[PDB]
Structures are given as C-alpha cells and as structure tokens.
Design an enzyme around this catalytic site. Sequence first.
Site, PDB file in Angstrom:
ATOM      1  N   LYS B 196       0.827  -1.194   0.000  1.00 32.00           N
ATOM      2  CA  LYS B 196       0.000   0.000   0.000  1.00 32.00           C
ATOM      3  C   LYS B 196       0.870   1.256   0.000  1.00 32.00           C
ATOM      4  O   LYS B 196       2.101   1.197  -0.048  1.00 32.00           O
ATOM      5  CB  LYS B 196      -0.961  -0.014   1.188  1.00 32.00           C
ATOM      6  CG  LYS B 196      -2.096  -1.017   1.043  1.00 32.00           C
ATOM      7  CD  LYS B 196      -3.173  -0.801   2.092  1.00 32.00           C
ATOM      8  CE  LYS B 196      -4.383  -1.684   1.823  1.00 32.00           C
ATOM      9  NZ  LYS B 196      -5.457  -1.491   2.837  1.00 32.00           N
ATOM     10  N   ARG B 230      -3.793  -9.543   5.932  1.00 36.08           N
ATOM     11  CA  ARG B 230      -4.092  -9.695   4.512  1.00 36.08           C
ATOM     12  C   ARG B 230      -2.899  -9.185   3.711  1.00 36.08           C
ATOM     13  O   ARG B 230      -2.587  -7.990   3.739  1.00 36.08           O
ATOM     14  CB  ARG B 230      -5.367  -8.942   4.143  1.00 36.08           C
ATOM     15  CG  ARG B 230      -6.002  -9.396   2.839  1.00 36.08           C
ATOM     16  CD  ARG B 230      -7.238  -8.573   2.509  1.00 36.08           C
ATOM     17  NE  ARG B 230      -6.915  -7.403   1.698  1.00 36.08           N
ATOM     18  CZ  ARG B 230      -7.037  -7.358   0.375  1.00 36.08           C
ATOM     19  NH1 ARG B 230      -7.479  -8.418  -0.287  1.00 36.08           N
ATOM     20  NH2 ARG B 230      -6.718  -6.254  -0.286  1.00 36.08           N
TER      21      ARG B 230
END
Lengths: 256, 256
Positions: B196, B230
């Site tokens: 991210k 995740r």
Amino acid sequence: MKLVAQGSTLDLSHPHVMGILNVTHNSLIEAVKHANLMINAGATIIDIGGEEVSVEEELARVIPVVEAIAQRFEVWISVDTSKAEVIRQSARAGAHIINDIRSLTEPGALQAAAETGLPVCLMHMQKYEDVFADVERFFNEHIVRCEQAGIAKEKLLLDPGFGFGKNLSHNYQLLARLGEFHHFGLPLLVGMSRKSMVGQLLNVGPSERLNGSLACAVIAAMQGAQIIRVHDVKETVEALRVVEATLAAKGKKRYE
Amino acid sequence: MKLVAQGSTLDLSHPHVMGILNVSLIEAVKHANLMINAGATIIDIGGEEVSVEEELARVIPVVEAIAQRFEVWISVDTSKAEVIRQSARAGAHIINDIRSLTEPGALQAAAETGLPVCLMHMQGQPPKYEDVFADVERFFNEHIVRCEQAGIAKEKLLLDPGFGFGKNLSHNYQLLARLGEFHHFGLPLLVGMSRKSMVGQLLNVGPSERLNGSLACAVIAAMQGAQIIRVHDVKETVEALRVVEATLAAKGKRYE
C-alpha cells in the site's frame, strides 16, 4: 542518548543499521566496494572483523580497511578484534567503536581499549538456569570490570549475544524481553542476521533467512534497540524506516 | 478467541495470513494452491461497475472450487446482496465487504447467512481527521450496533482500521502505532497493509519494491495481537509472523 568518538557524535535516538564487513591483495579494494554499497544502502556503521591468526597477520587485514573507510567515507567504523594491539592500532587509524567478541577478556585488551577512549560493546558469551538473569549477570560484572580500568559508563554498549552459546529457546526469550535491558541506561546492539534462530525455526538455508531476519530486526527496533547488525542493509533500512514512522506516531520510544 | 462458519472453526489464538486472490478459472485454483502451501489460512476473493451476473460468474465458480477441494477458509469481498447470499451457499466462511454492508440489502443478506462479517473503516469514497483513531473507534461503535440490530451477533464480527482508505501517511501510522488499543472491543482484528501507499510514500518506492516495508507492517501489527494479516506475499509473511509467534510464546502475549 549519544556516542562520541573521533570528534564526531552518533545520535542514537533513532535505530542505526550496522553493515557487516568481513576480511577473513585485491581484498582491500574489494572490501571498499562492499563498504560503498552498504553506505549507499543506508548503513551508518560498518563492522570490520578479520578473525587462529597472528597479530601481524591480522593488522595487515584490518588497518588498511579501517584507514580507507575513514578517509573516503563518513560512516562510523567498529572493529571486531580481541588483540590488544589491533585495538590500539585501529583507534589511531580512525575506528570509532571497539566491538570485541570476547568483551576485552584477552591479555591487555581491556587496558588497550582504555587508552583509546573509544566506545566499547560488551556481548554476553558462553545451558542456563534463566538466560535473561545470566545475561544480566554478565552485563553487571563486565560494566564494573570496564569501570575499574577507567572506561566510563558513557562509552559502553550492551549486546545480549544472540546465537552464542544459546539454543533457539534462549534466543527468543532474550528477543521477547530485549527492551528490559534498557534499565542499564546503555545502548543496545543486536546481531541476528542470517542466524540459526531464523534457520532452525524456518528450516531454510543461510540464503533464505532474510524474511525472518527482517522480522527479528523489526522486533528489536520496536523495543528500542539502537543498532542492528545485519548483512542485508538495504532491506533492513527499509524495514526500520517503517518502525521509525510507527514509533514517531506513538510519541514513546519503544513497546513493552 | 475463535470464529465459527460452515461447521469448521478458526482458532484466532495465533496470527493467520490471508492471501489475496483477485478475479481460465483454474488459474485462481492454482494461485490458491500456491498460497495454501505457502502458509495461507484464509484466502480473500474479490471481483471489484461489474454487474451482478458478471460478478457472480467471477467469484462463485472459484469459491466452489476452493471449498470442495481445499480445507482453507474463504472470505468474499463483495458488496452486492445476492453475491453475499450466494457465496455462503457455495462454501464461503467470511463476508469481507469493503463497504461494510452499506449497500442496499447487503446487511440483511449477510444476516441470513449467519457468517462472520468484517467491518472496515473508510472515508466514504470506495482527507482531514480531527483524530483518526477516534473516528475509526466511532465507525466501529456505529456499525457494530447496526449489525447487532440486524440479527448479526457480536461473536461474528471482525474489525479493520482500513489502512490507506481515505487516510494519508500520517493517519495510517497513527493507527498502526495504536493498533493494539482496538482490542477493547473484544473483536478480532484484520489488517491489510501489503504493497500500500504507506510503504511506497515512506520509502519513495514503486509497487514492486514494497515487500520489505510490508513485512515490517505485518510484523508490527502481529506484535500488537492482530489476528488476520491480509497480504499478497504469503510465503514471506508466514515466515515473518513465524518469528513473531516464537517471540510472543517466550513472552507469555502482546506488545504495548
């Protein structure tokens, strides 16, 4: 918390990455290239170690590397040697930290390191009754042993000694309670890169231990470990950069 | 702490690695086979304006293939009510909606399934916070009651701070530094930080060179008791959280 050596200071308020430079010819230039890579990768300190071996056979493998890095780069140099002569020679060459693996327990090494006035790193060395209590006991005995030789507390570093006389259980007991060693008021140096903690636990070769070594470096940095000695500098600097951002948003200095 | 669905239970006493399976339909089965062998316990499926008939065709034949062959848990990232009621019929375990079931009929559809539901905080676009931790804490209290008043019990609820969703780099690390404080809800924590913008904008790196920073975020989250991580890279994350497990075990079990 700081560290003073050779006129320059080392602000230990943030984690530093210590690159490993082993010299054990073209090796003088081949080690300078390896030092250039780690410094570009973010290594603030470079640990030089070349070790049996004669004092003459060791001075020729360490001194030219210490002089080359101290003259061409702006990074701190730590020398891993147990001989009193190499310690006194490295300080005049430009070394900043005496990182003896035997904690200056060799004849004359403690006295020679006291003459240099450089910071010294004490590392636990050796089955235990309580490995944390033994490492604590080791730290107290040798802190006094260095204060007896005129080495002030301000120039001392503590290292629990991961993988030296310890099994996988002893190592992770020290890793889990690493932040508790901060009560000595001294900087903490840990070396866990590509060691048997990652090898035995993950059942992988010495080249497939980066993922676990990065986890060990992060876990240590989350507890306030000031110096992380690694082989993979670029990956460790990037991992500690996330730890620095996390600790900055916390306000505190470590997790417990 | 556990989680029951489709007859099998998920022991959340240790961190679980959730693989990301984005969705010729056998390549998703192969990609699932790789992650399961890499250590993935849960596999997240998502088909992202896709129509209802197209999303049901993307997700369900993959869910049935994984449910009837492998023994791992399946979480579906869908916001359509019909896909929620159909995925549970196929063998899905967790309803991992990105919109937290705010779409028409998605809340009651997930209530009929009786499956655990994950609630993820989000700005509003599928920013400026006075206190991002207070808003995420506010988002949880509002949607926990919304799930409780719809028939969904508290025992079948997950919490996700929603890293990167309407949060700048400062907001994300304020939540990561205080991630353990979200345990007061008594609910399991799911975090997703792989590749991210936290790692990219902090390291000034592209999406391909974010594994080192993503592993650091996963380790930091696991040290604070996060139950589900995740990630895209399952093999490296399983190895990293494996060192985390050995550290928490010798500790006795969350850093703060």
